[PDB]
Amino acid sequence: LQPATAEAADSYKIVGYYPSWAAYGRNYNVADIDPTKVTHINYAFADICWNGIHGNPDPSGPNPVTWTCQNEKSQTINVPNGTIVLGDPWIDTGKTFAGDTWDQPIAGNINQLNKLKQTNPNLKTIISVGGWTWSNRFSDVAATAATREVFANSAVDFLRKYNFDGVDLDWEYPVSGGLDGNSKRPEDKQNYTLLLSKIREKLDAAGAVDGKKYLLTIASGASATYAANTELAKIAAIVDWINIMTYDFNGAWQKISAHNAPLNYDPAASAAGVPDANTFNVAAGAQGHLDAGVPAAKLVLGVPFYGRGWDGCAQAGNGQYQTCTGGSSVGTWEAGSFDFYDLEANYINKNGYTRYWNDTAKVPYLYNASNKRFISYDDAESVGYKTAYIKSKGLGGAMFWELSGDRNKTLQNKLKADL
Template sequence: MKKKLTLLILSIIVFISSYTGASYAENASLPSKRIVGYFAEWNIYIENNYYEVSDIPWDKITHINYAFAKIENGKIAIIDKWAAIQKPFGDDTWDTPIKGHFGQLIKYKKQFPNVKTLISVGGWTESKYFSDVALTEESRTIFADSCVEFIRTYQFDGVDIDWEYPVSGGVATNIRRPEDKQNFTLLLKCLREKLDAAGEEDGKSYLLTIAAPAGSYNIKNTEPELYHKYLDFINVMTYDYSGSWEDVANHLSPLYMNPNDPSYPERKEKFNVDWTIKEYLRHGIPADKINMGVPYYAAGWEEISGGVSGLFGTSSKTLNSTQFHYINGLLQAADSGFVRYWDEDAMVPYLWNPATATFYSYDDEVSLKNKCNYVMDNNLGGIMIWELSGDYPEGGGNTLTSVIYDSFVTAKNEMYGDVNGDGKVNSTDLMFLKRYMLRVISDFPYPGGKRLADLNGDDNINSTDYTILKRYILKTIDSIPIN
C-alpha cells in the first residue's frame, strides 16, 4: 500500500509539472501562454541558415516541435540520421549514446525542464503515407506503438502529427482517400490511448498535438469537433494564405480581412487568421486548446504591375519564401530601396520597392504584438512559430520570440479594471470605460483593455461592468468578480 501511495504521489507531481496550459502562470519567469517553436532539422547545414539546438531561446518558449520525422514501412522513422542522432556537438564523445540534435535536446532539457519537446511527424514533404497508417485498426496500432517506442528511446515528451492533408491537398504524390476524414480522428484516438498507457507505465503525461490547416476546404476534410478531445492542444497553421503558387501579391498571414482585397468573395472573407480561429471555435474546440501560428518568413513577388504600393498587384515572377532576418536586413540597408507599409485593415506590414517592383509580405514586431493581444483577448492557448531560425540575429537572435514572450509574461501582471494599462485601477479607468460605452472612443489606450474591462466575464462591456468598477474604486467591494 505504501509503495502504491508513493507511486500515486509521484504521478500527480509529474502530471502537474507537465505543462499543457495554465500551470506556467504560477511562475513569474514563465509565460502565461504556450509558445511553441518548430525546430527544422535541415537548418544544421550551412546553406540552410545554420541553426543549432543551442541557438534556440530556451528561456522564452514552452514547447519545441522537432521537424520532422517520416513514415517508413508503417512506422515513424528518422529522416536525416546524421543531423538527428550522429553529428557530434560540444562535449559529445565516441561513446555518447545519442548525439546529433536529439542528444542536444536531451542535454538542454536538463537545464530547462519546463520546456517540452515533441517529435513532429510528416509536414509538407513527408505526409505521403499517413493515409496508409490511418487506414485500419492494425495499421494505426503499428504506427502508434512505433511512436511510443520512438519517444521513449529519444526522450521526447510527446508526438505532433503534421498530416498535410487528409482527403486532398498537399504534395501531388501523397496517398489520399475519402475516408481519411474519419480515419484521421481514429488515428489520433489510437495515439492518445497508446500514449496514455505508456504514460501510466512511465509515470509521466505524454503530449499529443497536431498542426491543423487554415484553409476552409482542408478544415472540412477533418472532424475538429471530434478529434480535439484526443489532443492536448492544436497548432493552427495560420499562414500561407498567399504565396509563390499564385501571381497576385497578397498577405502571407493577415490578422483580419482587408475589405479592398479584389479576390473572389470566399477568399476575401476566409483567408485571414481571424476567420480561421473563429472557424475552429465554431467547431466547439475550447479556446485554450488553440495556438495561433505565426510565420518567421516572408512571401515575395517581383515584376508587379498595379495594386497599391504593390499590394494586390499582378506579378510575372514569384519569389521563394525567405526568412525574416533577410527582410530585416533590407530594412536596415539604407540603399535597399524598400519601404515598409502598414495595412491598417489586415493589421500586418509589407515591403515595397518601386524601382524593382518587388513586394514582400511578412510579420514583424508590431504585427506579432497585435497577434499576441488577439491571443489574450480571445483566451487562446498561445502562439506557434514556424520556424525558430527565421528570427534575425541582432539582440541574441530571438527578437521576434522576445516580443511574444514579453507579451505573455507581462500579461500575467494585468489587473481587471486597469483599462489604460498603468498598473492602477482608479477613476481614470472609470472615465475611459464610460467613454468607451458612450462610443466616444472605439478602443482603450491599452491593447488588452477590452479584456480587462469585461469585469463579470460575460463577453460584453456594458453598464454592469461600469457598476462593478465603480463599486471597486469606492471600496464597497474588495475584489472584482469574474464570472
C-alpha cells in the same frame, strides 16, 4: 528571488519549430536556441517507413528523395509499414556536438534538444511527423487498424528511445490538398480521428508505465476545406492541443500579391480577386476551429517568422494586391520566401524597399519601387496584434515556424513580452 505571483498568463504556450536541416548550410544549430523563449520545441521532422524506405519522390515538392529506413547509427532497419522513423539519422542522432562523448547512445540534433532541457528544465520537446513533404503516407497509415496500431506503438517507441515529451502529427492534409502525390481517401476524415485516438491510448499506457504525461498534438490547416475534411471537435477531445497553421495564405505560387498571414479580412483583397480572401486570414481560420467546438485553450495560433514575395508588381497600391509577374526569384534560402532576420538586415526600409502598413489586415509589407518586388511579412508590430488576438480569444498560446528564421530573437522576444 521571491516566489512570483501566479497569473493566468503564466500558462500560455509558445511552441517553436526547429527544422532538422537548419543544422546544414543555414548554420543554425540546436545549441543556438535560447530555451527561455519557448515552452515547447517541435522537432521537424520524423517520417513514416513504407516497404523499408521513407520519403517522398513527388517532383512538385522541394526534396524529391527517398532513403532506407534507418536507426540512430544510420544503419538500415527492417520495420513494419507505418513505423515512425528518423527523418535524417545523421543530423538527427549521428553528428557530435560540444558535450557529447563516445560513451553515449545518441548524439545529433536530438541529443542537443535533450541538453537544452538539462540546462533549462522547464522545456518540453515534441517530435513532429510529416509536414508538407512527408505527408504522402498518412492516409495509408490511417486507413486500417493494423497500420494505426503500428504507427501508435512506434510513437511510444520513438518518445521512449529519444526522450521526447510528445508527438505531433503534421498531416498536410487529410482528404484533399497537399502535394498531388500524397495518398488520399475520403475516409481520411474519420480515419485521422481514430489514428489520434489510438496514439492517445498508447501514450496513456506508456505514461502510466514510465511515470509521466506524454503529449499529443497536430498541426491543422486554416481553410474551411480543412475543417470540412476533419472532425475538429473530436480531434480536440483527444489531443492536448491543435497548432493551427494560420499562415501561408498567399505566396509566390500565385500571380496576385497578397499577405502571408493577414490577421483580419480586408475588403480590398476581395475586390482584387485574391483567391478565398473572405476566409484566408488568421482570425477566420482560428474562428473556424472555435466554431467547430475546439476549446480555446486547445487552440495554439501559428505565426510565421518569415515572409513571401513576388516579382514584377505594379506601383499601384504600393504593389499590394497587384497582378505581378510571378513569385519572387529571390529569397533567403529558397526563392520566394524571406526569413525575418534576413528582412531585418537587408530589406526593411533598406536597399530600396519601403515599408507600408495595412491597418485593416494589421500586417506590414515592403515594396521596392525601383525593382518592383513586393514582400509580405510579419514584424514585431504585427506579431503584437496576433498576441492581442490570442489574449482576447483566450487561446492556448502561439506556435511559430521557425526558430532559425528569427536569429536576432526579435519576434520571440515579442511573443515572450506579450504572452
